[PDB]
Amino acid sequence: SDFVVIKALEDGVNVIGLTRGADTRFHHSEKLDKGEVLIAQFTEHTSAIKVRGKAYIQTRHGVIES
Amino acid sequence: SDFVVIKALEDGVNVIGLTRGADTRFHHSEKLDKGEVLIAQFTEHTSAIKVRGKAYIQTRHGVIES
Amino acid sequence: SDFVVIKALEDGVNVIGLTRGADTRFHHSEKLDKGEVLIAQFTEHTSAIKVRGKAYIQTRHGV
Amino acid sequence: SDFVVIKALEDGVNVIGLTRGADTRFHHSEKLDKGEVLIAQFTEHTSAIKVRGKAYIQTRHGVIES
Amino acid sequence: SDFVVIKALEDGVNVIGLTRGADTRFHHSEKLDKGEVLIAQFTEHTSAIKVRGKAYIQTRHGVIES
Amino acid sequence: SDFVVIKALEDGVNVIGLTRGADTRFHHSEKLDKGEVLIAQFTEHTSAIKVRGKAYIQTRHGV
Amino acid sequence: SDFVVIKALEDGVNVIGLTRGADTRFHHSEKLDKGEVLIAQFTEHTSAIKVRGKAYIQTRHGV
Amino acid sequence: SDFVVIKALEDGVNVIGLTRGADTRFHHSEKLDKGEVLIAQFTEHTSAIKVRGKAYIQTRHGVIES
Amino acid sequence: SDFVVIKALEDGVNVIGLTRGADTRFHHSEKLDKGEVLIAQFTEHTSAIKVRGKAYIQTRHGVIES
Amino acid sequence: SDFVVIKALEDGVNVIGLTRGADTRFHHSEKLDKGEVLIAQFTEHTSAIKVRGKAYIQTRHGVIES
Amino acid sequence: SDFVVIKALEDGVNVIGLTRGADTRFHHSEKLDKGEVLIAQFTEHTSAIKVRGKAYIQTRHGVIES
Amino acid sequence: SDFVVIKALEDGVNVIGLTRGADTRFHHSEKLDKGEVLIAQFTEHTSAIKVRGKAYIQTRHGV
Ligand SMILES: N[C@@H](Cc1c[nH]c2ccccc12)C(=O)O
Ligand SMILES: N[C@@H](Cc1c[nH]c2ccccc12)C(=O)O
Ligand SMILES: N[C@@H](Cc1c[nH]c2ccccc12)C(=O)O
Ligand SMILES: N[C@@H](Cc1c[nH]c2ccccc12)C(=O)O
Ligand SMILES: N[C@@H](Cc1c[nH]c2ccccc12)C(=O)O
Ligand SMILES: N[C@@H](Cc1c[nH]c2ccccc12)C(=O)O
Ligand SMILES: N[C@@H](Cc1c[nH]c2ccccc12)C(=O)O
Ligand SMILES: N[C@@H](Cc1c[nH]c2ccccc12)C(=O)O
Ligand SMILES: N[C@@H](Cc1c[nH]c2ccccc12)C(=O)O
Ligand SMILES: N[C@@H](Cc1c[nH]c2ccccc12)C(=O)O
Ligand SMILES: N[C@@H](Cc1c[nH]c2ccccc12)C(=O)O
Numbered sequence: 001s002d003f004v005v006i007k008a009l010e011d012g013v014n015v016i017g018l019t020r021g022a023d024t025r026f027h028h029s030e031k032l033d034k035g036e037v038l039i040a041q042f043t044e045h046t047s048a049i050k051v052r053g054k055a056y057i058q059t060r061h062g063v064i065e066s
Numbered sequence: 067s068d069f070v071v072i073k074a075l076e077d078g079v080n081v082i083g084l085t086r087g088a089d090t091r092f093h094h095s096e097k098l099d100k101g102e103v104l105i106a107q108f109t110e111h112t113s114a115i116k117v118r119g120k121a122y123i124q125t126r127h128g129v130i131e132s
Numbered sequence: 133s134d135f136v137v138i139k140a141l142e143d144g145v146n147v148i149g150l151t152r153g154a155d156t157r158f159h160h161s162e163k164l165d166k167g168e169v170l171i172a173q174f175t176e177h178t179s180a181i182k183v184r185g186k187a188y189i190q191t192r193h194g195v
Numbered sequence: 196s197d198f199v200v201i202k203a204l205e206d207g208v209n210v211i212g213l214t215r216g217a218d219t220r221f222h223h224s225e226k227l228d229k230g231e232v233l234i235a236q237f238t239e240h241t242s243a244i245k246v247r248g249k250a251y252i253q254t255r256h257g258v259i260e261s
Numbered sequence: 262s263d264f265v266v267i268k269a270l271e272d273g274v275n276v277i278g279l280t281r282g283a284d285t286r287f288h289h290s291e292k293l294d295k296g297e298v299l300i301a302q303f304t305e306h307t308s309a310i311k312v313r314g315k316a317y318i319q320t321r322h323g324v325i326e327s
Numbered sequence: 328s329d330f331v332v333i334k335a336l337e338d339g340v341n342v343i344g345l346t347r348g349a350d351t352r353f354h355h356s357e358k359l360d361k362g363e364v365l366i367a368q369f370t371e372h373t374s375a376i377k378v379r380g381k382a383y384i385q386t387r388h389g390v
Numbered sequence: 391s392d393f394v395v396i397k398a399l400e401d402g403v404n405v406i407g408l409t410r411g412a413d414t415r416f417h418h419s420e421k422l423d424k425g426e427v428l429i430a431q432f433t434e435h436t437s438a439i440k441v442r443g444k445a446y447i448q449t450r451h452g453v
Numbered sequence: 454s455d456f457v458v459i460k461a462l463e464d465g466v467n468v469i470g471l472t473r474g475a476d477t478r479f480h481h482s483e484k485l486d487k488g489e490v491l492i493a494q495f496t497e498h499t500s501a502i503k504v505r506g507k508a509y510i511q512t513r514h515g516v517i518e519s
Numbered sequence: 520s521d522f523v524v525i526k527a528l529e530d531g532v533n534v535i536g537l538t539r540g541a542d543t544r545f546h547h548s549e550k551l552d553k554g555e556v557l558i559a560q561f562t563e564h565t566s567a568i569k570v571r572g573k574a575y576i577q578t579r580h581g582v583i584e585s
Numbered sequence: 586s587d588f589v590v591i592k593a594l595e596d597g598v599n600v601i602g603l604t605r606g607a608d609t610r611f612h613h614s615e616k617l618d619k620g621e622v623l624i625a626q627f628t629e630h631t632s633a634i635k636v637r638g639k640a641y642i643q644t645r646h647g648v649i650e651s
Numbered sequence: 652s653d654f655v656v657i658k659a660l661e662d663g664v665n666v667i668g669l670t671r672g673a674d675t676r677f678h679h680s681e682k683l684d685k686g687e688v689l690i691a692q693f694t695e696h697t698s699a700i701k702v703r704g705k706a707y708i709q710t711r712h713g714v715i716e717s
Numbered sequence: 718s719d720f721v722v723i724k725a726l727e728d729g730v731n732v733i734g735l736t737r738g739a740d741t742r743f744h745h746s747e748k749l750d751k752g753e754v755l756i757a758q759f760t761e762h763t764s765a766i767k768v769r770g771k772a773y774i775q776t777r778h779g780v
């Protein structure tokens with residue numbers, strides 16, 4: 001059951017969950033300050049994740065460091 | 067369930083989800099500005115994903131960049 | 133479910149979904165201009181995919 | 196759920212589906228011109244696939260390039 | 262379900278499917294001329310496949326050529 | 328389901344299917360002439376396979 | 391079920407469990423002092439985990 | 454669903470099936486002459502196999518050549 | 520089901536299990552003196568494990584020592 | 586289901602199956618003379634196998650010889 | 652279905668099972684003298700295992716030799 | 718189901734099966750003399766195995 005690891009590399013990074021279903025809207029925005037990590041799953045409610053700001057991101061497919 | 071990772075390499079990248087089913091239309095477009103990342107699942111509503119604009123994309127099959 | 137990755141290397145590449153079932157016809161053609169990417173699954177409705185135009189294609193079997 | 200990748204290397208290549216069941220007959224013939232690719236699954240209706248003409252073919256078992 | 266890949270190395274190759282069940286007879290023969298390829302599943306009707314003629318054959322177990 | 332690959336290296340190779348169940352007898356013998364190939368599955372009806380004659384044989388365990 | 395490993399490298403590291411469901415709020419914060427280790431699963435109730443403070447973190451994806 | 458490969462290296466090799474159940478007795482003995490191969494499964498009726506005589510034997514665990 | 524391995528590197532190491540569910544409290548603490556080892560599963564009652572004191576810990580993800 | 590491979594290195598090797606269940610007794614002993622091989626499954630009746638005499642034994646865990 | 656291998660390296664080593672459920676208490680203590688081995692599963696009744704004394708311990712995660 | 722391989726390196730090695738359930742007691746001890754081999758499964762009835770005496774032991778975790 002897949003998840004994403006997200007480490008903020010600066011202040012005020014946002015990790016935003018988007019709603020599962022016919023409709024797509026942001027249901028929640030988690031704020032990360034520098035060096036804070038968010039380990040976040042895809043779930044019954046979240047089918048897409050947006051990251052804004054400079055962040056090191058780990059997934060099953062590998063790494064993308066801003 | 068499988069997911070794509072999309073990082074924007076310029077401003078104004080569109081990640082477009084196509085409806086699952088007999089019919090195919092765009093149901094949602096997500097604008098990504100430079101540096102921003104979207105990780106998006108295939109879902110009971112999205113069976114095809116379309117990226118317009120300069121992107122770095124990881125899937126289960128490998129990298130595809132530009 | 134398995135999927136294909138198609139990157140258009142010219143304008144007007146067509147990604148064509150053929151119908152699942154006894155009958156085979158196309159039900160949709162997605163057009164990509166140069167540089168655009170389609171990630172497309174096999175589904176309840178699409179059992180074959182035809183790309184026409186120059187494309188870089190990735191599947192579970194390789195490039 | 197297995198599939199075959201078929202890339203025509205000349206004009207007028209045919210990819211022919213054969214019917215699943217007691218009876219075997221061609222139910223459909225897809226024409227490929229040079230450089231067109233067909234990614235085709237085995238399905239409830241197709242249990243065999245014939246390719247006529249010069250074609251690069253990819254499957255789980257590897258490659259056969261005419 | 263598993264499948265065989267047969268490429269004809271001369272004209273007039275026969276790919277023959279044998280009936281699944283208590284009884285065993287040929288139910289279908291597919292003629293392949295030189296260069297042509299058949300990818301054929303084992304099915305609820307075919308439990309044994311027979312190739313006559315010069316062929317290149319790939320299965321899950323490896324190559325067998327001539 | 329698992330399968331065997333048999334290539335005949337002489338004329339008149341016999342691929343013999345033995346019956347699944349309490350009783351063991353052959354129910355079928357498929358004959359191959361030199362160069363012919365049989366790919367044969369274990370099935371509801373065949374639980375053992377005997378090859379007689381010179382053959383190159385491939386199974387999941389090797390050659 | 392998958393889990394995370396968190397080792398605190400300062401005092402007062404917070405391991406925060408965010409709620410599973412339509413609503414997202416924290417339901418618990420576990421505090422670790424320097425050197426302490428939390429191994430924590432994703433559960434029926436926690437679908438996201440935020441670490442705040444300097445920590446060495448291990449997941450199935452690496453360090 | 455496990456099987457054993459047995460190749461007789463001399464004349465008059467026996468491959469003997471033993472009965473599954475509380476009771477153990479030989480239910481069948483297959484005779485192999487030199488260079489004959491038997492590919493034999495474990496089944497609802499056979500839970501042990503005995504080989505007598507000089508034989509090359511292949512299983513999941515590797516090879517034992519008399 | 521997955522488990523952790525904890526070896527105490529000093530006297531007085533605490534292995535604490537946290538309750539699974541909507542609520543989170545300590546339900547049990549296990550004191551380990553130097554040299555002693557605990558292997559503990561995640562369970563229908565414990566969804567998070569906490570180690571205080573100098574420990575060597577192995578999990579499915581690797582070693583973590585001190 | 587898993588199986589053991591036993592090759593006799595001398596005459597009079599015994600392969601003994603122990604009953605599965607609350608009780609444990611020998612239910613069958615199979616004499617193997619030198620060179621002979623037994624491949625025997627664990628079954629709904631045999632949950633432990635005992636070899637007396639000089640044997641070469643392969644299991645899923647590796648070789649054990651003498 | 653996971654298990655732990657435990658080999659006592661001195662006299663009077665204890666392997667203690669702890670109860671599965673809301674409650675945690677020692678339900679059993681197995682005494683090992685030097686060079687005795689215990690191969691012990693996690694079960695419906697045992698969700699944690701404590702080892703006291705100098706012992707070589709093998710699990711899925713590797714080795715810890717006192 | 719998983720199993721253990723025990724080869725006795727002296728006379729009178731005991732392979733002891735401990736009972737599965739709330740209660741833990743031995744229900745059986747299989748004795749091996751030098752050179753004898755026991756391959757033994759974990760079962761509905763045996764959840765722990767104790768070897769006493771010098772033995773070479775193989776499990777899924779190694780030797
Ligand atoms: N509401 C959409 C969210 C989504 C997932 N993947 C996407 C890809 C593109 C656009 C939107 C999406 C869905 O559940 O399907
Ligand atoms: N069949 C999908 C859309 C789709 C997937 N792959 C395709 C390839 C080409 C065209 C459309 C598609 C649907 O449910 O609508
Ligand atoms: N209508 C066909 C489409 C198809 C899938 N694979 C094929 C291979 C060859 C020809 C057609 C096909 C089907 O569902 O079966
Ligand atoms: N009607 C046949 C088609 C087929 C599949 N594999 C074959 C091999 C040989 C000949 C025919 C076939 C079937 O479904 O079984
Ligand atoms: N048992 C298959 C045919 C078959 C498979 N493998 C064989 C080997 C030898 C002879 C026949 C067979 C059937 O259903 O008829
Ligand atoms: N009639 C036997 C055929 C068989 C399978 N494997 C064997 C091994 C040895 C002897 C006979 C067999 C059965 O179904 O069980
Ligand atoms: N309440 C959210 C928590 C969450 C999980 N993954 C996320 C990713 C982004 C934002 C929030 C989340 C949910 O269960 O779906
Ligand atoms: N009747 C026995 C046959 C058997 C299988 N494995 C064995 C090992 C030893 C002795 C006999 C056996 C059974 O089904 O269990
Ligand atoms: N959600 C778990 C506890 C838990 C797991 N991971 C966490 C991370 C942070 C906080 C609490 C937790 C519970 O059932 O109570
Ligand atoms: N528990 C098995 C026998 C057994 C398996 N492993 C053991 C180890 C020791 C003693 C007995 C056993 C039975 O059903 O009887
Ligand atoms: N009674 C506890 C035992 C336990 C398992 N893992 C633990 C970790 C820490 C403390 C206690 C435990 C349970 O079944 O959950």
Ligand SMILES: N[C@@H](Cc1c[nH]c2ccccc12)C(=O)O
Nearest residue numbers: 668694696697737738740741764
């Ligand atoms: N009666 C115990 C036997 C046991 C298995 N693993 C253990 C670990 C430690 C102590 C006892 C055990 C049980 O079934 O649970």
